Amino acid sequence: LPEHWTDMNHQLFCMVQLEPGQSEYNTIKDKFTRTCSSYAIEKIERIQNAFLWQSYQVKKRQMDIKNDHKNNERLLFHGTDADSVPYVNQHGFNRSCNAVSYGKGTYFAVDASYSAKDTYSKPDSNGRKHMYVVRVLTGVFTKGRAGLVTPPPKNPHNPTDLFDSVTNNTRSPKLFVVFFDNQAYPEYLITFTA
Amino acid sequence: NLPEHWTDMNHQLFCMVQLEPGQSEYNTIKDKFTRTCSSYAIEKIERIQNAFLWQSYQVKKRQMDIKNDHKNNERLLFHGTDADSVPYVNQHGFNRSCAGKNAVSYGKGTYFAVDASYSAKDTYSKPDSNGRKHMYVVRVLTGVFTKGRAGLVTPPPKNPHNPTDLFDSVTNNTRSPKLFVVFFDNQAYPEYLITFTA
Numbered sequence: 001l002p003e004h005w006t007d008m009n010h011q012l013f014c015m016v017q018l019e020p021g022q023s024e025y026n027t028i029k030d031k032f033t034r035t036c037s038s039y040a041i042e043k044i045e046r047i048q049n050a051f052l053w054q055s056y057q058v059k060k061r062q063m064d065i066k067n068d069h070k071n072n073e074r075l076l077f078h079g080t081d082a083d084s085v086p087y088v089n090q091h092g093f094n095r096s097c098n099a100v101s102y103g104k105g106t107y108f109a110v111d112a113s114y115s116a117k118d119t120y121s122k123p124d125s126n127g128r129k130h131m132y133v134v135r136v137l138t139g140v141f142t143k144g145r146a147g148l149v150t151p152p153p154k155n156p157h158n159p160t161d162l163f164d165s166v167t168n169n170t171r172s173p174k175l176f177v178v179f180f181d182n183q184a185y186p187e188y189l190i191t192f193t194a
Numbered sequence: 195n196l197p198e199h200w201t202d203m204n205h206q207l208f209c210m211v212q213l214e215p216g217q218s219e220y221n222t223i224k225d226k227f228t229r230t231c232s233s234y235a236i237e238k239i240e241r242i243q244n245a246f247l248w249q250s251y252q253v254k255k256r257q258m259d260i261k262n263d264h265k266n267n268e269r270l271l272f273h274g275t276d277a278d279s280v281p282y283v284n285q286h287g288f289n290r291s292c293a294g295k296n297a298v299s300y301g302k303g304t305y306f307a308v309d310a311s312y313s314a315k316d317t318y319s320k321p322d323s324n325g326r327k328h329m330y331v332v333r334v335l336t337g338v339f340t341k342g343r344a345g346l347v348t349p350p351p352k353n354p355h356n357p358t359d360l361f362d363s364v365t366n367n368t369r370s371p372k373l374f375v376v377f378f379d380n381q382a383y384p385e386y387l388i389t390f391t392a
């Protein structure tokens with residue numbers, strides 16, 4: 001389990017509220033405020049989910065072998081409604097659960113501002129919005145298209161050797177779509193307001 | 195962590211191994227199959243050695259074994275499919291996003307049968323242009339299960355007031371289970387591919 005995690009008293013799930021002004025809080029706050037400096041942060045919580053982390057690290061080791069190099073991982077944003085937060089904290093991201101123009105997967109934004117739209121981070125009855133900071137195994141990617149259920153093949157002559165993810169634009173990506181469980185680890189939950 | 199009876203794959207991550215009749219491994223799968231499908235004949239039985247699917251599956255099994263209270267979480271079940279799906283299942287396993295609607299739906303997931311006779315239906319194991327039918331024998335993490343419902347995209351909660359604490363799978367009938375539905379990747383390991391004909 002990672003260094004920066006705090007002790008869980010032999011439990012396998014904890015949401016840990018970060019201390020404002022310490023290094024970890026400042027790093028995550030800066031990634032958000034790059035594009036969302038007009039929003040008010042109520043809190044940032046570290047997601048310590050041992051089972052999700054295990055399953056994700058296994059996928060990461062496998063993708064590092066398959067792709068014959070590292071650099072398979074990116075930090076991305078995911079806005080969601082308050083009713084989905086408990087599910088994501090416990091079970092992560094489920095493609096089976098908005099527009100799906102680049103395929104039937106889970107969508108992650110490069111910019112917090114994109115995930116901050118009310119259609120994604122729906123304001124709850126008290127006006128609070130929720131956005132995850134997500135470790136995503138984007139790996140080797142191609143342009144997506146409507147109706148994909150998995151990424152395309154890297155060569156139609158080996159139809160089972162797939163891209164790891166798809167994007168809106170391969171030269172200047174602003175979103176990524178992954179199509180498999182455990183390709184995304186929800187690392188921080190930001191609670192914020194307009 | 196690959197099983198010690200697998201054949202050497204020489205740094206490769208995937209191998210299909212043809213089993214020999216007379217070996218206990220071939221004969222127990224043949225018996226499991228013929229118990230309900232004695233009218234069909236087996237062409238061959240291949241052991242699926244997929245290092246990546248095995249690792250992800252064994253991680254999910256250890257997690258369910260920890261979470262559940264000394265349960266037998268794992269059953270050996272059947273899955274009939276078309277020849278066009280065999281290369282994908284062999285490499286990537288069972289994808290709920292590719293699943294057909296079942297004639298009796300207990301949820302939107304991947305279906306597994308207790309009896310080979312059910313998977314032997316032409317609806318599931320579609321005969322290819324040479325008349326070969328294909329059925330996987332599958333390690334499935336059924337865990338703790340309940341009767342499913344056609345609307346499900348995940349197993350239901352055990353308790354409505356704790357919506358995130360889920361059953362592991364659903365069935366058609368908890369007293370006499372004949373099918374299981376799983377809603378997550380890496381909850382099933384395709385262990386053997388049976389090729390068979392009328």
Ligand SMILES: O=C1N=NC(=O)c2cc(OCC3CC3)ccc21
Nearest residue numbers: 078079098099101107109115120
């Ligand atoms: O942050 C997000 N949370 N949920 C989404 O569905 C989502 C979707 C998304 O791109 C969808 C548009 C059609 C290409 C971007 C971000 C998010």
